[PDB]
Design a protein around this ligand. Structure first.
Ligand SMILES: [Ca+2]
Ligand SMILES: [Ca+2]
Ligand SMILES: [Ca+2]
Ligand SMILES: [Ca+2]
Ligand SMILES: [Mn+2]
Ligand SMILES: [Mn+2]
Ligand SMILES: [Mn+2]
Ligand SMILES: [Mn+2]
Lengths: 237, 237, 237, 237
């Protein structure tokens, strides 16, 4: 199977696979069963912002999610990504719905990776920023139900013309260029990602959520990864 | 044929195809016959730096090349790149040798593109920076004789193990992700590129040169584009 | 007197000092009588964005102003800023009102300056970005009526508690650090500025406007520079 | 006294004030007696590079120092800088000599600070980069023996015309603009610094070292802070 590291914004509590009894943010290392979670006071229909940070010196993956006029949620996990991920990866966003549903709308997405070697003035870097998505966005790989250009947004899961989110949907966007997160001369490797999102549901129980993920470069949506598996995992192990 | 916009660092004067009688920097719009040139006091065996800038408001492509402890050469040309290039492009470096030869070594390469729309806080951006090239650089497309990872450099043309440059060589490196240089809501589009290079020849007459270029995304080395055609053009029209 | 280079967003036509008969954007070199102007379809009560760009190779100062869902206005002027400004400057925003009035509210302001020398990998750079202004913003020099921290904005001119703009007001904000825009080894010097603004008036005839400016480091508001003089000039010469 | 947070590159072991028996990198929180140290294989006469990173989510100050062709040294310390430093600070470099001496030459220095609030698209940022220092560098505050512009470098301590380092010297450079490292709406605050340095001594025992530091904005060199106190502390408590 693929190798996945993800930060989940998990809108539906699946307590049978170890979710807490509430919407939560989590850090997923090769499993949907988050290694660490925090309570998330998700706001139906409001624009939120998520920040993800990591560096190879501290080996700590951290994330913060907030809405305007509200307190943040934060989660951290100690993990050496050089022991989990290959040296070249792709980065992306994933989302799903199941019998319960929501919009999984991405309004902006930025990413920076840096690899600093012991050579004098020797940083390698990649940065991208999308504030508007176009109908034919050639620097994104869209998978499953993901589409771009409707109001300049990335719709990770299926939405009707009238704007109703559909059930049993899964979709992903990956940046086209591979990202280098380890090199033998590297003294520090870091990355940061930010995305803004709008999760709206006509229902009291939205599902299933959005994730930022890092994967092997050839990652594809696993078979049957609608609903609680967030487009990331083939099963709940 | 491909569509090419390039800044050439032209080490060998081909006066029969309109080069001036000296090494020169030039701006090439869909032809090896530069629309504008400036005299370039090329230094055999020294590390040089080239800077290329453009924006869609001024519609002027400019370049500056320098060496430490020396005066710069500069060239500019008024051109609307939205009338020359497609809306999605790839960017890259090209170099060639012919019967006369030189190393075409790239020590670093950085690039930034920005597309700002009339949406409040709506920039799209791409930035990359290579200060060290690795043996298997997955975010570069290498064409022809180009190789990476020898002393952390990009060798655009063939060099022996003993470091001797070879004749009749052509090679290109392109960044893997397409670049968006026009969008219908854009109020300003810009890019900048920088590269550092080492051109060394055992001969009094080095050839043929290095170019930074922008192309259709599917660009490949034209047949017979060794020597004076710099890996960019199928003929001298 | 001070030395001033400015891009004006001029909301009130003073045809006696050479304004065109309409709101306009202009480039001001040591005079309120703009060297170049363009018609500006100013929108009372809407958030606008202005972009200013310059580099020392092309020696062209350009600006673009837009609102969402509207066409942009643009103006350019050929000028060698190394012949107008000292090598060290301060950058800032200025605004004024007179007998006619408006809010001169700044919601965000960013600035980047770069000085690249002929030394290998030798850029000097300054970048700042304000998306929220605080009540005691120590990296800004406020002059005249300018205040910060009301709704996280910079109010360049006086506004009552009920939000009514006041007449006969002038105010400026300058970034605290001086900016280096020339050095003897520089091969290219550039800057870019962006700001977002909200000009609102209860009146059919708002005045007087907002400017981005570059000045000698010790610049202060000239005596009597309310109204048409935009906080920048001591007279209309 | 001032409030100081510093990363020390400590070239001389003062075992009486808790240094280990070897050159070391350390994290100093309001004391020269480092809270954490790591062995540093300092290279007399070689150019080194130091990297310092921090963020408010992980509350961990980390540093890495390396030379080309050598293994790095790294040190980390868990500390909430919002409990140590004021909300506005200055950042700088410090160095000293005593009866033992060395050059404390800075070849480049860069710094980035970011404060992200819970407002949609609301980052405040400061970035500067010096690759060449000029004789009259108006965006630096020089203290004590520090000078700029000799070969484009910052000499933190006294060096003769023939290049001999002098004993009993102390000097500091601070960036002119205050830096905002806390705000009540901040969800994440971070900074990174990099500097390149050349420590050369005619002696087998160089002293005393270089530090990157963060201070109250009005910080000055403490009386008697030559030698082991690195220009940072009034005593060895
Ligand atoms: Ca769940
Ligand atoms: Ca030629
Ligand atoms: Ca006017
Ligand atoms: Ca010591
Ligand atoms: Mn979960
Ligand atoms: Mn030519
Ligand atoms: Mn005017
Ligand atoms: Mn120590």
């Amino acid at each position: 199977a693929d190798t996945i590291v993800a930060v989940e914004l998990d809108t539906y509590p699946n307590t049978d696979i170890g979710d807490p009894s509430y919407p939560h943010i989590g850090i997923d290392i090769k499993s949907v069963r988050s290694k660490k979670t925090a309570k998330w006071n998700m706001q139906n229909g409001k624009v939120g912002t998520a920040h993800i940070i990591y560096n190879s010196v501290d080996k700590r993956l951290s994330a913060v999610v907030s809405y305007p006029n509200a307190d943040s949620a934060t989660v951290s996990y100690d993990v050496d990504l050089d022991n989990v991920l290959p040296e070249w990866v792709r980065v992306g966003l994933s989302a799903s719905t199941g019998l319960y549903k929501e919009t999984n709308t991405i309004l902006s997405w930025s990413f920076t990776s840096k690899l600093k070697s012991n050579s004098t003035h020797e940083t390698n870097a990649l940065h991208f920023m999308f504030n508007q998505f176009s109908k034919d966005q050639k620097d994104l790989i869209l998978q499953g139900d993901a589409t771009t250009g409707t109001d300049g947004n990335l719709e990770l899961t299926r939405v009707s013309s009238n704007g109703s989110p559909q059930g049993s949907s899964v979709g992903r966007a990956l940046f086209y260029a591979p990202v280098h997160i380890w090199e033998s001369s590297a003294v520090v490797a870091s990355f940061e990602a930010t995305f803004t999102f709008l999760i709206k549901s006509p229902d009291s129980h939205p599902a299933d959520g959005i994730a930022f993920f890092i994967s092997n470069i050839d990652s594809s949506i696993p078979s049957g990864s609608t609903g609680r598996l967030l487009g990331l995992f083939p099963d709940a192990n």
